[PDB]
Curated annotation (Swiss-Prot), chain B:
N6-succinyllysine: modified positions: K1, K63, K69, K84, K100, K145, K317, K328, K365, K479
Keyword Cell wall biogenesis/degradation: no
PANTHER family reported for this sequence: 1-PYRROLINE-5-CARBOXYLATE DEHYDROGENASE FAMILY MEMBER (PTHR14516), DELTA-1-PYRROLINE-5-CARBOXYLATE DEHYDROGENASE, MITOCHONDRIAL (PTHR14516:SF3)
Described purpose of this protein according to its UniProt entry: Irreversible conversion of delta-1-pyrroline-5-carboxylate (P5C), derived either from proline or ornithine, to glutamate. This is a necessary step in the pathway interconnecting the urea and tricarboxylic acid cycles. The preferred substrate is glutamic gamma-semialdehyde, other substrates include succinic, glutaric and adipic semialdehydes.
Protein name: Delta-1-pyrroline-5-carboxylate dehydrogenase, mitochondrial
Recorded family membership: Belongs to the aldehyde dehydrogenase family.
Native source species: Mus musculus (Mouse)
GO molecular function: 1-pyrroline-5-carboxylate dehydrogenase activity; aldehyde dehydrogenase (NAD+) activity; identical protein binding
Amino acid sequence: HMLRWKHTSSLKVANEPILAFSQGSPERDALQKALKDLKGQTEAIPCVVGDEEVWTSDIQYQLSPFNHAHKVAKFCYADKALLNRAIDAALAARKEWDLKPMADRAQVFLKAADMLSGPRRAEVLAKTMVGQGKTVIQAEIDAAAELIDFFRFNAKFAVELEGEQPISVPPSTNHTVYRGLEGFVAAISPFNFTAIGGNLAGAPALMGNVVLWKPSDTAMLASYAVYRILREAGLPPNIIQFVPADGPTFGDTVTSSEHLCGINFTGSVPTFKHLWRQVAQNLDRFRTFPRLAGECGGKNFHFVHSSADVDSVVSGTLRSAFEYGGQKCSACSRLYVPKSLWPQIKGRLLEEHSRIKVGDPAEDFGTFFSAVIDAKAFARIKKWLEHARSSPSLSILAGGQCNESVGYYVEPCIIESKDPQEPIMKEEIFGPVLTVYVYPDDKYRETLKLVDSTTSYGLTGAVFAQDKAIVQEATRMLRNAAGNFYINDKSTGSVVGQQPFGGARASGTNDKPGGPHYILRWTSPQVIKETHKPLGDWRYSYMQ
Amino acid sequence: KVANEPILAFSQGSPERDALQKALKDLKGQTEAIPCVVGDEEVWTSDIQYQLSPFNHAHKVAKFCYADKALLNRAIDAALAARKEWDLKPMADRAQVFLKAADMLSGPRRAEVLAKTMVGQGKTVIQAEIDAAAELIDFFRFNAKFAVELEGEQPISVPPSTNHTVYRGLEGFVAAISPFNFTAIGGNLAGAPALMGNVVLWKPSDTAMLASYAVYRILREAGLPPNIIQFVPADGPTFGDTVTSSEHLCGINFTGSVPTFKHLWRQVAQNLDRFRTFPRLAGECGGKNFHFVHSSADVDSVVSGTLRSAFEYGGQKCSACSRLYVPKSLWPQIKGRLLEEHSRIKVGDPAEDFGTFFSAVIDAKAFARIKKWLEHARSSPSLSILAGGQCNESVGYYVEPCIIESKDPQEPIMKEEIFGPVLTVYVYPDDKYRETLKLVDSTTSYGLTGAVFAQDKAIVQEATRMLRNAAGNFYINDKSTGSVVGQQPFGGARASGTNDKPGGPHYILRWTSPQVIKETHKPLGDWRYSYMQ
């Protein structure tokens, strides 16, 4: 045997525990200190290519959503020259990184996970709160738990993947080499989860790829924090290039490179489609066929059957619809309620609604949710609330007020539609706006079909019911309406390794980050067969 | 639990040789009228076509027809109507259809599918055996195993919630477009997605219609319900235009030319706003495969392995060796032996003469394309035909094996896929082996198969590293063809396709779109959090 293959080991990981932040607790004190550390501060965040900090003339600012007078970061957009230089340098670093043992690459992410878990936790939480407007618990489940879990679980999945080997029969030995993709990957991340940015850039890097990471403008502060932690954890230069940029410019540049091998995208449907078309237009230029991965949002439902637990419906719906101001691709924005339960549910929703506190998440930990992300989001939500007032089929039951004088503040809003096909039942708002449709109990089956057919999306959904037969029926009927389906729980809050996340229809390519197969999109395997005996004649015995 | 199907020896007086000879006699002089099949309906259009026996083109082995746009659209509608129930079936129940089909192919139907592959596609006994029997049987058994085991891949549950992954088929229909050169590939392209709960429009290759329909009928007989796989031969562009125009397209499983795959990819992109979801394109697109020889190589192995790789089935494999790199020190040996063995190759009727090494190429178009390359080899200042090159299409599409030396390592013939029995050899100076390895990697647009012959461990290690992306199926001291399911999952990148590795455990993942279900068994409680108090 001329090729010697070293045995592969296993890795033990578990989900990162969620902290409680009780009064007087070390994590609460640490977080308050980290928040104080950001008050009045603006970080100047450069593009990073290799180890070089680069500034262009295209200066941009990230504002604190709940206090937009506070510029939390000054950054810049990479120009096309810098993006191309970043590509060249990444490509020149790629072969060495790809040849590194999987275990050695995994170690970088395991180190980073430990840093985030401990000494850097308060920092990434605070930067996510101040820069993206998250409350303590929303930052904790995101910038700490989910990001840490992505890093640890993907490391486990990747190390274990090398143990997936083919059959060998004499006189030959077969081995699969899990190559990174030949070229570079473009990672394009969204504002709403710090963890997503880390995963979009980090997972391909783990698999031996090199990456140009364009982070979200409105999440720049936390994103750079994560980038620095990766570098400190031992990520070599030119493996992930930190290149904020104008979206169209970035897409134009990466899709014009013969060396593009993948785009890992989370964001709007039209932008993903645009990139898909650009790659198609440029097919004859590429050295290989680029792999596009996209997660693209939803119009997610909570469906209530007459047998539902009312209290669970209420609390689960309030959380799903309004946590982080409803700015989740998984947030519930349509609630279907049977007539029989509407009196109870409506009463309870309105009462609980009046107790929801909207405000500054850094100064007041009593805050349930804070301002929406930016002026553009605020303007869009304003238009939908105006639509609700104008539309004869819509009625605002609670909330409906807004104020952008200090932050981009929007009250949680509950709207009733008499029309199950109203535009507000179909279009993703990405704001704290829940629409309710009340259906006659005996039409629950017909209404389940409407849940399935009304929107273009297939991301998340929940059924609330205590009747087993009903749960089985609804589970069958709604099979393609939700890639993450919930029985008697809210439609948000997927946990890595427990609810791998993603959906189809217009919601994306459904590669299930958070599960064991996601990493397979970022490797292009090679199989090597070594034969240990001479071949013999070209003829076969049957020919004699 | 599954193992590879045994490859039979077909010795004189063996049961399999007797059975095959009978099956060949069963086809002599026969033309099968093969309809389009939509559900259980046998449909005929006026667009009548014929499949000819490559080595005796006067023999029309099948009459079939092209589905028109209207028929293809009906096939889509009927398939979509059957999909929900099929997808709702337990994975094991779907797997059973393929396991039954595999047993049928292994036993009572083996001679039939071999014979139809020999007569219809021009394969010899052993080429038909490794394809229509072993490879197809293995695809069915191994994919069934992988699929049943995939359901065991489940997430973590923590009280008071239970999490379960449902491996849904893709929502919509999948278009499967298969090539002439392996009966097994057609079975896999249509079969693998169907196994995973999809419904499929299968456009089989015109020039493999007889064997393709045989496989189709076996699947139906094995229990495949109506409208899960529609059997729809069609004009290539018409089929492509029709399926990419449907809002319900969810995947294309393709094996064929780069330009055709690129065209389909562009059609899907043009129509993105029409589709209910993002279609998944899988393409296996050929190669320009190498055998690289180091001075330490076992010459006998180089010779036999290269003759087989380059010439078996007339070189009509995406994995076939078409460029051979030889060090000057070994050239007199290798040249002498290749030319001597070349004279002993028998090209002829594989049904009538089991002495035949390989037979006619597939059709008139292939014959014409290969002739163009031979004419180029007779023209180019850097090329010399050392042996072979003769051709005669009077009775069958017969092209003799041809061995060419190129003085130019980057001549067009070193770069472009011919799909015929045409081997080009480049002789390199021993001291320039490293420079030449770089040329192996940089010369072509392809990344499919390649082999290094060497007995020096350090050389093998170096060559393996340098050629990491030059071949997705890489061979040390073996020929570049003949991948076996479960042993060498098959595929490569660069221009050679999307590399989804059919034959390995991950291929089926392209044909499922998972759903995760979380059920919580306790009431939720307050929406507030303790830290907020």
